[PDB]
Amino acid sequence: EQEIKKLNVIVDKIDALEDSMKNLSYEELKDMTAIFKNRLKKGETLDDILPEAFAVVREVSKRKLGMRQYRVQLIGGIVIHQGKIAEMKTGEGKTLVEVAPVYLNALTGKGVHVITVNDYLAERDKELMSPVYESLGMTVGVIISNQDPNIRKQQYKCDITYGTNSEFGFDYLRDNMVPDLSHKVQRELNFAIVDEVDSILIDEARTPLIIAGDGDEDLKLYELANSFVKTVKEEDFELDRKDKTIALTASGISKAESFFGITNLTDIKNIELYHHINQALRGHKLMEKDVDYVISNGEVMIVDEFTGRVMDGRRYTDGLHQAIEAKEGVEIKNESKTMATVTYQNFFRLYEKLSGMTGTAKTEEGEFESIYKLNVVQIPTNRPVIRADLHDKVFKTEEEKYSAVVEEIIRIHKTRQPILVGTVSVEKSEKLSKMLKKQGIKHQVLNAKQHDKEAEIISKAGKLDAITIATNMAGRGTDISLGAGDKEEEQEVKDLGGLYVIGTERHESRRIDNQLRGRSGRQGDPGTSRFFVSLEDDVIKLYGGKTIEKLMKRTSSNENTAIESKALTRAIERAQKGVEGKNFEIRKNVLKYDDTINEQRKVIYNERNKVLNDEDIQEDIQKMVKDIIQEAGETYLIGRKRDYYGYFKHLYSTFMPADTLLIPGVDKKSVQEIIDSTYEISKRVYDLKKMMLGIDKVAELEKTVLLKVVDQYWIDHIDAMEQLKQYIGLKSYAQKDPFKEYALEGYDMFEALNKNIREATVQYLYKFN
Numbered sequence: 001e002q003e004i005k006k007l008n009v010i011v012d013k014i015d016a017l018e019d020s021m022k023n024l025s026y027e028e029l030k031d032m033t034a035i036f037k038n039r040l041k042k043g044e045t046l047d048d049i050l051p052e053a054f055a056v057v058r059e060v061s062k063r064k065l066g067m068r069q070y071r072v073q074l075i076g077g078i079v080i081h082q083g084k085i086a087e088m089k090t091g092e093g094k095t096l097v098e099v100a101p102v103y104l105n106a107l108t109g110k111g112v113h114v115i116t117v118n119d120y121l122a123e124r125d126k127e128l129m130s131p132v133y134e135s136l137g138m139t140v141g142v143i144i145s146n147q148d149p150n151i152r153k154q155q156y157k158c159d160i161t162y163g164t165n166s167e168f169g170f171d172y173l174r175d176n177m178v179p180d181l182s183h184k185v186q187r188e189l190n191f192a193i194v195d196e197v198d199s200i201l202i203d204e205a206r207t208p209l210i211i212a213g214d215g216d217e218d219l220k221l222y223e224l225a226n227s228f229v230k231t232v233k234e235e236d237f238e239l240d241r242k243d244k245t246i247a248l249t250a251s252g253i254s255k256a257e258s259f260f261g262i263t264n265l266t267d268i269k270n271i272e273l274y275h276h277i278n279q280a281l282r283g284h285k286l287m288e289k290d291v292d293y294v295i296s297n298g299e300v301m302i303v304d305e306f307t308g309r310v311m312d313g314r315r316y317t318d319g320l321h322q323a324i325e326a327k328e329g330v331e332i333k334n335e336s337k338t339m340a341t342v343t344y345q346n347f348f349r350l351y352e353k354l355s356g357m358t359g360t361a362k363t364e365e366g367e368f369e370s371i372y373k374l375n376v377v378q379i380p381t382n383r384p385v386i387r388a389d390l391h392d393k394v395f396k397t398e399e400e401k402y403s404a405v406v407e408e409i410i411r412i413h414k415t416r417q418p419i420l421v422g423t424v425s426v427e428k429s430e431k432l433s434k435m436l437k438k439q440g441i442k443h444q445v446l447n448a449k450q451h452d453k454e455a456e457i458i459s460k461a462g463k464l465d466a467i468t469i470a471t472n473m474a475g476r477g478t479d480i481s482l483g484a485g486d487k488e489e490e491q492e493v494k495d496l497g498g499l500y501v502i503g504t505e506r507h508e509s510r511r512i513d514n515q516l517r518g519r520s521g522r523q524g525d526p527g528t529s530r531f532f533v534s535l536e537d538d539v540i541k542l543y544g545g546k547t548i549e550k551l552m553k554r555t556s557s558n559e560n561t562a563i564e565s566k567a568l569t570r571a572i573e574r575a576q577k578g579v580e581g582k583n584f585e586i587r588k589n590v591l592k593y594d595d596t597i598n599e600q601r602k603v604i605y606n607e608r609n610k611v612l613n614d615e616d617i618q619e620d621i622q623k624m625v626k627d628i629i630q631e632a633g634e635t636y637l638i639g640r641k642r643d644y645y646g647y648f649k650h651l652y653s654t655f656m657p658a659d660t661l662l663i664p665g666v667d668k669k670s671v672q673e674i675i676d677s678t679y680e681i682s683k684r685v686y687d688l689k690k691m692m693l694g695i696d697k698v699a700e701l702e703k704t705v706l707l708k709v710v711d712q713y714w715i716d717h718i719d720a721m722e723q724l725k726q727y728i729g730l731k732s733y734a735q736k737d738p739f740k741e742y743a744l745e746g747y748d749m750f751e752a753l754n755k756n757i758r759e760a761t762v763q764y765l766y767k768f769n
Helices: 002-022 026-042 046-065 071-081 094-106 119-135 149-157 165-175 197-203 217-230 250-259 268-285 320-328 344-349 362-372 398-414 426-438 451-459 487-495 510-518 538-543 546-553 566-612 618-638 644-654 671-693 695-727 738-766
Strands: 085-087 113-116 140-143 160-164 191-195 208-213 237-240 245-248 293-296 299-303 337-343 353-358 376-378 393-395 419-423 444-446 467-471 499-503 527-534
Touching (some): 002 046, 026 119, 046 119, 071 085, 094 191, 113 165, 119 140, 140 165, 160 165, 165 344, 191 197, 197 344, 197 353, 217 250, 217 268, 217 320, 245 268, 337 344, 344 362, 398 499, 398 527, 451 467, 499 510, 510 527, 538 546, 566 695, 566 738, 618 644, 618 738, 671 738
Parallel strands (some): 113 191, 140 160, 393 527, 419 499, 444 467
Antiparallel strands (some): 208 337
């Protein structure tokens, strides 16, 4: 309320400025982008310049679109500017509301992302609003699926880029899968306005964004690595049963490189081949059937050394399991491979400034503030809503209800009022449509299969004899104008009561119910809506409880008569809130599983970027080197009581070149100076490297390897964490939450990931120079 008064005082300022914009030329209006930037360099903030800048946009808007913004459109724009969700009904001009705040934030030159739910929408909307951004001297881009990358970076280069939610996501993952910084397509994730914020950020929130890779080579590599190991003789590898290491000897390397037709197997270029080879070796000579793993029902299964029983489910990490599949003649898995993933939720949280619009979001406000720091402001409508939202017409059976819907559509169709029928699936749409065809009724069916074609059709849905069956995801973003652009047909159809809205099922949420109603009664227009439902409908039947159960058990009487009573109405409403409650509670619970992989992922991506953008990673390599030494110090010199043979055999198999570990004074030399001394020997290995190749090649090599190693291990960790979620599905405990195991094991796994990266980076930089 006071909230609206505040917004209104700002709008008053825009209106005061109208007169002056009215008498400027086109070039004067366009010259305002430079006046705004220069003043921004001088001291004013976007908040200080917004009135005048909105005034510039209304004006260019009036002349170029012939759409002068209304007060409530400017209010929505200010809210969006605030990095909030403006709740605006269907027909309030969301697409237009976006132009002023977008334009305002595009002035920083940092870029702005206007997000849609699909390709057709993003292109249409950008094409439609381009004349105004261009008339203000800015450039607009757009991102869609059938798109050339070269064009892709350019779209992000414009001051403004349009695109659908998933493509801004896909691009982000790809940018963190790149080898060279100058391969990225994006700039900073600055500001994002998300359309239909509740379906995206709430309903679809968990949607995984996956960049996946083909298992073409993984399958040949696994096959080939296995037959190459099969020809290996004892003189080709050195193994240690006790400490479980196995490395190829020099003859092993030769047989290997001649076998695979390669030149230096240990060089970083062959990381992938070398890694599949070490796993076959290990799989073949360190693991044994009926001791380490068993084969049952055609699968390699892990034996728990704690009981000798199998670990139903669990798989070996880093290709080791496949290695054993090939080794045993078992079906290796051709499962699709995931190179990168992020959900909508975690992706939209990455923006410095977030925003959104929707027709209904106030009820989910707690969650929007909790998850994203988004608050909701309800923007009053331009005109009063007179659409009659009538009470549900209830039936005992689904067949009675559809039969009743066909008749209601006939009765109305005969008065030639247009009818929008809401449905919950392509299958319902077809059942309904086949029933209208039975009675000779012409109509159109929108299945959200082809947005553009569906769009021209939904636009004509406000015509005189219009009947349109629309699935819940068909025809969004297009307005249903009464009379389709004819003043005579519009007032006529308007005289008739506007668009008639019929729902054939209640949805999993009252919001979607409201979104179907919102299809009619736009901008002051008349209209009517009603829901036809029945006890057999999913929400009623799955969540309505004992009252419904009893009702469905009764002996069927009075076919086709509607049912009603207050107690029937309390149980119908209660059922809907039940699924709303459940869905809400499931969201909350999956959130902590999702946050855990999300927090891992931010650390690995920040690191990966630190590499991609330089600054300096040489100390980080020196920290990994020290790390490995401290750990070996702890495992062998302390855990095993100065087991020098093992301390050095371990450091040697890990990364140190042969015969370098000579320390005297050992035996009455503290463990720390044994680590300090060992480190100085490492520094001299690396001094030899710097003298042979030069500091530049050394620092660069660091870059090349750290990156290739992080990718190798992080793609496997991704898979291993998904496997972890799967396993904690089963075995639970009488203590507290399945989540606690999950977290504990996730943490141990995350430490195992970083231990792997360092040992492999460091080996590669130090062991084979």
